[PDB]
Write a protein that binds this ligand. Structure first.
Ligand SMILES: [Mg+2]
Ligand SMILES: [Mg+2]
Lengths: 178, 178, 178, 178
DNA sequence: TAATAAAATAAAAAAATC
DNA sequence: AGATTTTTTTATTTTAT
DNA sequence: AATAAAATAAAAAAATC
DNA sequence: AGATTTTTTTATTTTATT
DNA sequence: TAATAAAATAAAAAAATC
DNA sequence: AGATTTTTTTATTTTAT
DNA sequence: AATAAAATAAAAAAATC
DNA sequence: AGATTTTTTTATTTTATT
């Protein structure tokens, strides 16, 4: 059992913090992918499909943090730009599934190449901690909180992106490459 | 140095973790302020003027993570709803200072009465951690990152809210009241 | 559940750490008190009495992490040196109580004067962390572990020492004094 | 910078934690090894020499947090009990290098099979934390502090012990075996 | 709709001019 | 750029004999 | 039992704002 | 330099969209 | 005891010496 | 410098009519 | 049950390694 | 400078104490 004050204190503090973060993250994310004329959720969708091939609209709307409507509309615009593949399987024909086309994987890799960590603000904001820790910050308390909110299945996005990028990419001339 | 691989690993973990965390906080925040016909940034501006009286447009755009222009446009709607008061100053009339009207302060205080932490998802997410530790999670690594991004003066908002809630408010019948 | 390998991995990591930590704290503690011809458990006994006046030999042994016989022998050795006043009282007389004499209080505070944090190596080892955090490390994970082993009653010594030192003392010429 | 009050608020908190933690580790470690009539520092020496074959007396004293006189005398007693081999090198003859004999390896790995986590207090104190996290506590803050006090070369023992337990041992019938 | 760049604008400060 | 509603569609599911 | 009819509920998909 | 003029800088303020 | 001061002692390197 | 053992000592608990 | 006992337990107080 | 001698430095190695 808890004081109401002590809740307001915790609720307001993590509000400000999570808004400060993500806005900083959103800015650096949209700056990096505007050259390729992708918006944030769009790019997130393509990454959802690369790690989770064949996902359903509601499934990608799960792993990217977006409404089901946003996923359908932004994923069909990725279809017309030729970056996404829609599909249906008629055991249950209410369900529309998406796959990444070759063009889309390509722009993912090219965006991966244009990545410059130094122009990302939380990267630079986290480097102090890394220096004395020996590793980048884990932010485990946040991962615990997120898990209890979204469920362990959601958290599959993390380790699918961890293992895949550790094995599906390498560094040559200071850029990430396949 | 660091690997550009090791960098991406950290950047995708924090990116998704914070989009998760903000969106969760976003919807719970929208839900409690719609009864009084506010949006997040409007409510955010009102709390900033409560804690930082007579602050510049650019200042409340600093403390609330918003653009100067969104600060000025939502700050004017708040005075057309009567909740804010605009002033200018002797030394430099380019600045425009903002104060809370007592209609504005009232709706803040009434919303504080409606606050049910049980309906906030991040709060329920942090309860298991609160039990083990005995106090709420501090997410200290994130406070450090945000600080090295926004700088020490942005971080006065956390301290001013902490002190003000603690010394301006008090519990009665499970609600926070003056 | 846990694998035996995973558990051994944790049990050696903390055994080596707690040994390392305790031994450096042991040396600096001895340096500090050898001038006054005290030993660790004697100095801890006197500090237990200062925070917990009228405490039993068994009770002193709880907070001082020492065997009850160890407390007994070292405690009456302190009475010969005239810093401790034994008592026996009221209903039950198998219990032997302790309080701190005038001579004992002064040697505490005088040792508190000779305190130089820079000669203590664990202080120095935490200074890099304190810069980045703002405050000293909270070492919460071992605080949780130490509680689960010893119980919430035991952890009252932390809480009693925190409050007493905070306002039974003040700083003068780089010295703690009453 | 820091206060002298703030400095000793930290010094006492880690003194008391360190002592509490080392003494529940002390007595759990003793109980485990008395069956094979070893003491803690003798058992440490056997694990130092297993992980670091050919270690010097001084080096053994580094990794096992003990005086060079104790590591010598307890290394001797291990030679008289037939578990450690004493060597010299003709290039520099003031050095004296230690190496486990096969009788020495066998007693270590029978004790490895004797290991029951559930009799260890610190393990059980840590199980609630492993529940929330998914992994055991890392107490990074204590690793940071200990690395600054002892230096990065000492800290090699954690990394070698980690990887050696990982690869040299396997789980058969709920016990760690080679 | 809740935000936001990209202009636009007015005022203060800073820099040029002699 | 990214929501909320509402529609509209399919398939389970639940009834009703 | 079987069915067949009738809500109820999954999953999109299509206008708002 | 001291009195003026010019350019830049700062802070909005409004406008064009997502 | 399970430890560790404190000398004590052999070697080796380092400084000195001319 | 610290314990693990012994002992010893009250008070409490349990067992007996 | 009311007592008195045998037994148990608590808390020191000793002697070892 | 090169060969020598002499000091310090290092690593045990043995003592005695809480
Ligand atoms: Mg933590
Ligand atoms: Mg605690």
């Amino acid at each position: 059992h808890y004081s109401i004050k002590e809740a307001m204190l915790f609720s307001q503090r993590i509000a400000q913090l999570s808004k400060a973060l993500w806005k900083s993250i959103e800015k650096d994310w949209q700056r990096w992918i505007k050259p390729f004329d992708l918006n944030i959720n769009e790019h997130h969708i393509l990454w959802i499909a690369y790690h989770f091939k064949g996902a359903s609209i509601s499934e990608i709307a799960k792993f990217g943090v977006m409404h089901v409507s946003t996923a359908f509309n932004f994923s069909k615009k990725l279809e017309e730009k030729g970056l996404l593949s829609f599909s249906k399987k008629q055991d249950d024909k209410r369900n529309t599934y998406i796959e990444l086309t070759e063009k889309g994987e390509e722009v993912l890799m090219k965006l991966m190449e244009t990545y410059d960590p130094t122009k990302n603000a939380v990267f630079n904001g986290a480097l102090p901690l890394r220096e004395l820790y020996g590793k980048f910050p884990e932010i485990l308390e946040m991962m615990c909180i997120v898990r209890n909110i979204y469920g362990d299945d959601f958290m599959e996005i993390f380790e699918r992106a961890f293992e895949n990028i550790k094995e599906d990419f390498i560094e040559q001339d200071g850029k990430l490459v396949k």
